[PDB]
Amino acid sequence: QPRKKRPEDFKFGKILGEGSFSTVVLARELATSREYAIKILEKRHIIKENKVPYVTRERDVMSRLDHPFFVKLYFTFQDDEKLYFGLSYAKNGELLKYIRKIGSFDETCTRFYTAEIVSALEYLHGKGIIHRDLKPENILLNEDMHIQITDFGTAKVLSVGTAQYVSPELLTEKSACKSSDLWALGCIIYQLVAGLPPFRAGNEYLIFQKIIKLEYDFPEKFFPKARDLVEKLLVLDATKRLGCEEMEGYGPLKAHPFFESVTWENLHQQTPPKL
Ligand SMILES: Nc1nc(-c2ccc3c(N)[nH]nc3c2)cc(N2CCO[C@H](C(=O)Nc3ccccc3)C2)n1
Numbered sequence: 464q465p466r467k468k469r470p471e472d473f474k475f476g477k478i479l480g481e482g483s484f485s486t487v488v489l490a491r492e493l494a495t496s497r498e499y500a501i502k503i504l505e506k507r508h509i510i511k512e513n514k515v516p517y518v519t520r521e522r523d524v525m526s527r528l529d530h531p532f533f534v535k536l537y538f539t540f541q542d543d544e545k546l547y548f549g550l551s552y553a554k555n556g557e558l559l560k561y562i563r564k565i566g567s568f569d570e571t572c573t574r575f576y577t578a579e580i581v582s583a584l585e586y587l588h589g590k591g592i593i594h595r596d597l598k599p600e601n602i603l604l605n606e607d608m609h610i611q612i613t614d615f616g617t618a619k620v621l622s623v624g625t626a627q628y629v630s631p632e633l634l635t636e637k638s639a640c641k642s643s644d645l646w647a648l649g650c651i652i653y654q655l656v657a658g659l660p661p662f663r664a665g666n667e668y669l670i671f672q673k674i675i676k677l678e679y680d681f682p683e684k685f686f687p688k689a690r691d692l693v694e695k696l697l698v699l700d701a702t703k704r705l706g707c708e709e710m711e712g713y714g715p716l717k718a719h720p721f722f723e724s725v726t727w728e729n730l731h732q733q734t735p736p737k738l
Pocket residue numbers: 479480481482483484485487500502517534550551552553554556603613614615616617
């Protein structure tokens with residue numbers, strides 16, 4: 464392996480993202496002219512706020528992963544005050560931005576991007592890893608417009624996330640499983656099509672109320688096969704969500720009529736439909 468990298472090895476530029484206890488900064492490595500998204504954390508702050516387990520979890524998970532649809536951790540280093548994680552730079556930023564930009568996806572784009580997310584989760588879950596906070600904000604887009612999923616501090620490795628995407632089991636048990644990610648997937652599909660998350664309200668409490676009641680509905684202009692699929696994912700009983708182990712996994716999920724024209728084997732090699 465190459466020698467440990469250091470801050471002076473890079474020219475730092477603009478801020479790419481702000482976390483609860485971290486900041487992601489675009490950086491160019493001088494020797495290679497390569498661009499990385501460097502996540503910077505203050506050791507003192509992480510210790511003071513008892514965040515060490517989240518930092519460690521993200522490092523350990525983002526290292527075990529080797530798949531095109533996930534942001535990769537290339538290297539780490541530190542100076543007296545800070546930790547630096549060198550991550551893949553996804554030039555086109557957050558999926559959330561594109562949803563806001565174009566309003567709502569047509570069926571061809573919904574299907575392609577939904578398929579990449581499903582394919583990514585199949586990989587992740589096959590490694591016994593659960594994301595636990597999947598959302599448009601951490602589904603990034605590469606220069607090529609393929610997804611790259613990031614933000615793994617909340618992940619769990621098998622032996623409360625963002626309000627709008629929280630699964631019922633978190634609200635009623637404080638427990639999460641692979642199926643929690645599938646619930647998130649259902650919300651994300653709904654949002655790609657409707658342009659809005661399914662569970663919306665004045666505040667967090669009211670959102671949680673709707674979730675545990677499964678109180679939401681489809682606009683008239685919702686692709687019917689997408690609706691059927693969403694209905695098989697947004698299910699209160701976590702053991703009855705399409706894709707989960709008790710439902711026999713990813714086979715039946717990928718075989719859903721909404722994905723009829725999808726070629727699953729090489730999505731990363733296909734050219735994404737123009738947004
Ligand atoms: N790994 C990671 N990558 C990015 C990122 C952003 C832009 C990028 C680009 N343009 N290319 N690559 C990029 C990578 C951002 C990010 N988050 C920022 C938002 O907050 C999160 C947080 O605090 N999560 C949390 C909070 C508390 C506990 C556990 C987890 C952390 N995490």
